[PDB]
Amino acid sequence: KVYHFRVKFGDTDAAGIVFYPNYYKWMDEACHHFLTELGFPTSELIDKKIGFPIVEATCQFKAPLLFADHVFIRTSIRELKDKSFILEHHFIKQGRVIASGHEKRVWACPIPSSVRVAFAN
Amino acid sequence: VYHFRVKFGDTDAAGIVFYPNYYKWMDEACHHFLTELGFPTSELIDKKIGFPIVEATCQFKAPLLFADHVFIRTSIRELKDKSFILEHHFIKQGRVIASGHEKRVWANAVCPIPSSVRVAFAN
Amino acid sequence: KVYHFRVKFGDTDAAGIVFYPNYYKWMDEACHHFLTELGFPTSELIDKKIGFPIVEATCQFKAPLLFADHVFIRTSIRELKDKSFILEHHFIKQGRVIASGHEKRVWACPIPSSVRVAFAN
Amino acid sequence: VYHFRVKFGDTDAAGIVFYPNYYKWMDEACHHFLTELGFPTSELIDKKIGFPIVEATCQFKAPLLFADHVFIRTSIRELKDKSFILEHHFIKQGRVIASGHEKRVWANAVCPIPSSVRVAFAN
C-alpha cells in the first residue's frame, strides 16, 4: 500500500529540512491508512477503546525531505505473530527511497481474525 | 508564571518559530495556571472534566528564536458563570514579544465553572 | 479557495478531540495552498529568503473536530494593504462551519505587484 | 540529564503519548547534551553547523501519560571520525520506561566531528 503526503512548512526546522521526528508521524499516518484501506477504518476501532500501540520503531534516513516535496510511503507487513506484527515503511520521493523503517505494534489481546485474514491479503 | 525554552523542533525553515506553537504554549500556560491554583488538570482530564477553548487570539511583536528562554504571564480577565478568559503575555529578555488570550468554558457538555475554581479565580 | 485535509490520529489529544493549536497549523497550511494555487508556489518564495510571516491570528471554535474527519477550509483575502493583508479561513465539515478565523500577515517590504494583481483576482 | 514534563498536547485520543514525541524528546536531549558539554547548539545552527540524524530507534516499555515528570539519561556510545551514537533512556518514577538511540553525523555536506567536540566526547 501507498500513502501520499506533502511536506508542510510546519514540518521543517531551522536547518531548512524536515525535523526528523515527523518521519514517525508519517509512519503512524501510513499505519492508520493501511488498516483503513484494508477494510478497518481505524476511527471506529479507536472508539471501541481498541488500538495497536507501538512497541518499537526505527527509521533510517538516506536523503533530506524539503518543504513542498510530494512523497509517499510504501507500506507492508513483514512479520505477523499472534499478538503483534511489524509494518515496514519506505519513503519514496521521485522513484527514490529517501528513508525506510518499521513499527512493531501490538493489539489492545491478540490480533483479530478479520485482521489476520486481511493480512494474509 | 510559566517558563519554557524554544526547542529546535519549534522552529521552521524561515529560521524562526512556527506560530501555532504560541497557542501550544498558551495551552501549556493555562494548564500550569490551574494547577498552581490548586487544581491539577491531569486530575480533571482523568475525571473527564475540561476547560475547552471557544476562542483564541495572539499578537506577535518580535520573533522567538531557537533556544530562547521565555515565560508567560497569565492573568484571568472575564470571569462569568460558564466561561472565563485568560490573558497571556510572552516575555523574552524582560520584554513582551507577543500577547494573546483564550476564551474558555467549563465542560464535562458545557457547564458552570465549579465553585471552588470560581473562588480561586475570584482571588 | 478550498483546502482539504483529514484529522490525523496525532492531531487529537486525550480529551478525544482535536488539540486546538492544530487549527492554526491548518490555517498556515491553507495560507501556503492559497498563494500556490494562485500562482506563487511558496517553496520558491521561501528559498528566496522571502516570506509572509504572521502578525496576528485568531480563531473561534463552534464544534469539535475528531479523528478521521474530512474537513476543508474556505479561504479568502479580506483586507489588503500595502505591506500587509488578511486571510479569512472557514472550517467546513459536512456543509457546516465548525470554526473560523483569520491571519494578518505581512511581506518580508511591500507586497509584490504580481501578488497584488493576483489578489484582485 | 534532560528533564521534561508531558504536555496535554503530547497526548492523543488513546489517552497516552503519541510515539514520535519520544523522538522529539531525544532530539531535545541531544541538544541539551551538546550544550552542557560546552557547545551551545543555537550557536552551531547560526553558523550552519549541525549533527543530522542518520538513524533512530526507540523501544517503548511503559506508557507516558499527561503530566508525567520524566528525564532522559544520555550517554555517547559509538564515536567514530565522522559519526556518533547517543543512547537515551527515559526514566519515569525512577524506572526506565523507554530506551533508544540516535546515530548522528556532523555536517556543514557531512564532515568530521570537530576536534574540540571529539575530545569532549572522549571524556
Side-chain angles (χ1 to χ4, degrees), chain A, chain B residues 1-122, chain C, chain D residues 1-122:
Chain A
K1 261 328 155 197
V2 164
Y3 173 64
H4 288 86
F5 63 94
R6 303 203 178 174
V7 175
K8 313 307 183 184
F9 185 68
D11 296 329
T12 71
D13 59 49
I17 71 163
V18 180
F19 178 57
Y20 94 82
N22 287 131
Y23 290 78
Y24 302 84
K25 176 241 290 169
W26 294 316
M27 295 198 299
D28 183 83
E29 288 173 18
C31 166
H32 291 91
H33 179 265
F34 188 78
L35 280 170
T36 288
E37 287 276 316
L38 188 147
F40 308 72
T42 54
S43 40
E44 298 175 355
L45 311 169
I46 273 66
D47 282 313
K48 313 175 180 63
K49 166 65 202 296
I50 68 96
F52 35 83
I54 191 66
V55 302
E56 202 262 299
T58 318
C59 195
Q60 178 185 69
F61 308 90
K62 323 286 288 180
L65 275 46
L66 306 171
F67 174 42
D69 290 348
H70 307 359
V71 191
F72 64 89
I73 297 182
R74 284 210 228 258
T75 296
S76 64
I77 186 167
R78 293 182 183 174
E79 177 161 295
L80 163 64
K81 295 183 162 357
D82 197 22
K83 320 171 202 173
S84 62
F85 63 101
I86 285 140
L87 298 174
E88 284 279 341
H89 294 117
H90 295 272
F91 295 69
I92 287 77
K93 175 183 168 186
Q94 293 172 332
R96 307 178 71 166
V97 186
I98 62 74
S100 65
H102 73 248
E103 298 167 322
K104 189 204 230 263
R105 316 187 70 128
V106 305
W107 223 259
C109 55
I111 299 138
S113 64
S114 169
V115 204
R116 298 296 299 278
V117 184
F119 289 156
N121 307 140
Chain B
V1 290
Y2 176 60
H3 283 102
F4 76 89
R5 301 211 186 174
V6 177
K7 312 315 181 162
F8 185 60
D10 295 320
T11 71
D12 59 47
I16 64 151
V17 171
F18 189 37
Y19 63 89
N21 294 117
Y22 289 78
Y23 301 91
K24 167 207 199 294
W25 289 319
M26 283 185 306
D27 187 84
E28 303 177 9
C30 169
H31 279 86
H32 167 279
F33 183 73
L34 282 172
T35 290
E36 295 288 293
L37 275 178
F39 313 89
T41 65
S42 57
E43 165 60 28
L44 300 155
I45 301 291
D46 181 65
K47 292 313 195 284
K48 179 59 163 60
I49 301 180
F51 30 95
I53 194 81
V54 284
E55 184 166 21
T57 318
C58 204
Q59 192 178 92
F60 314 89
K61 309 316 288 205
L64 295 174
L65 304 175
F66 171 41
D68 275 351
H69 300 251
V70 194
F71 69 84
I72 289 170
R73 286 207 183 96
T74 302
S75 43
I76 187 173
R77 90 141 182 269
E78 189 139 346
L79 170 76
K80 307 195 209 180
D81 170 46
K82 296 196 259 176
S83 74
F84 65 101
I85 295 180
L86 296 177
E87 199 179 81
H88 294 115
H89 293 290
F90 297 71
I91 288 87
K92 160 178 147 165
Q93 302 184 331
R95 301 184 38 250
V96 181
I97 61 75
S99 55
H101 64 87
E102 298 178 319
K103 185 157 176 173
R104 301 180 176 262
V105 296
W106 207 268
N108 195 260
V110 297
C111 67
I113 299 168
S115 64
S116 46
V117 179
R118 191 175 51 245
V119 167
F121 285 160
Chain C
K1 261 328 155 197
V2 164
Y3 173 64
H4 288 86
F5 63 94
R6 303 203 178 174
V7 175
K8 313 307 183 184
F9 185 68
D11 296 329
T12 71
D13 59 49
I17 71 163
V18 180
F19 178 57
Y20 94 82
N22 287 131
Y23 290 78
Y24 302 84
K25 176 241 290 169
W26 294 316
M27 295 198 299
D28 183 83
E29 288 173 18
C31 166
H32 291 91
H33 179 265
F34 188 78
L35 280 170
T36 288
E37 287 276 316
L38 188 147
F40 308 72
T42 54
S43 40
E44 298 175 355
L45 311 169
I46 273 66
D47 282 313
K48 313 175 180 63
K49 166 65 202 296
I50 68 96
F52 35 83
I54 191 66
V55 302
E56 202 262 299
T58 318
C59 195
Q60 178 185 69
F61 308 90
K62 323 286 288 180
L65 275 46
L66 306 171
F67 174 42
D69 290 348
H70 307 359
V71 191
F72 64 89
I73 297 182
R74 284 210 228 258
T75 296
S76 64
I77 186 167
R78 293 182 183 174
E79 177 161 295
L80 163 64
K81 295 183 162 357
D82 197 22
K83 320 171 202 173
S84 62
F85 63 101
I86 285 140
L87 298 174
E88 284 279 341
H89 294 117
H90 295 272
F91 295 69
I92 287 77
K93 175 183 168 186
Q94 293 172 332
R96 307 178 71 166
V97 186
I98 62 74
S100 65
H102 73 248
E103 298 167 322
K104 189 204 230 263
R105 316 187 70 128
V106 305
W107 223 259
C109 55
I111 299 138
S113 64
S114 169
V115 204
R116 298 296 299 278
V117 184
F119 289 156
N121 307 140
Chain D
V1 290
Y2 176 60
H3 283 102
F4 76 89
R5 301 211 186 174
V6 177
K7 312 315 181 162
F8 185 60
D10 295 320
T11 71
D12 59 47
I16 64 151
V17 171
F18 189 37
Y19 63 89
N21 294 117
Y22 289 78
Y23 301 91
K24 167 207 199 294
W25 289 319
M26 283 185 306
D27 187 84
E28 303 177 9
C30 169
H31 279 86
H32 167 279
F33 183 73
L34 282 172
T35 290
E36 295 288 293
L37 275 178
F39 313 89
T41 65
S42 57
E43 165 60 28
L44 300 155
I45 301 291
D46 181 65
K47 292 313 195 284
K48 179 59 163 60
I49 301 180
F51 30 95
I53 194 81
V54 284
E55 184 166 21
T57 318
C58 204
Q59 192 178 92
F60 314 89
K61 309 316 288 205
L64 295 174
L65 304 175
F66 171 41
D68 275 351
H69 300 251
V70 194
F71 69 84
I72 289 170
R73 286 207 183 96
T74 302
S75 43
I76 187 173
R77 90 141 182 269
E78 189 139 346
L79 170 76
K80 307 195 209 180
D81 170 46
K82 296 196 259 176
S83 74
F84 65 101
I85 295 180
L86 296 177
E87 199 179 81
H88 294 115
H89 293 290
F90 297 71
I91 288 87
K92 160 178 147 165
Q93 302 184 331
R95 301 184 38 250
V96 181
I97 61 75
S99 55
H101 64 87
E102 298 178 319
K103 185 157 176 173
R104 301 180 176 262
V105 296
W106 207 268
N108 195 260
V110 297
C111 67
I113 299 168
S115 64
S116 46
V117 179
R118 191 175 51 245
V119 167
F121 285 160

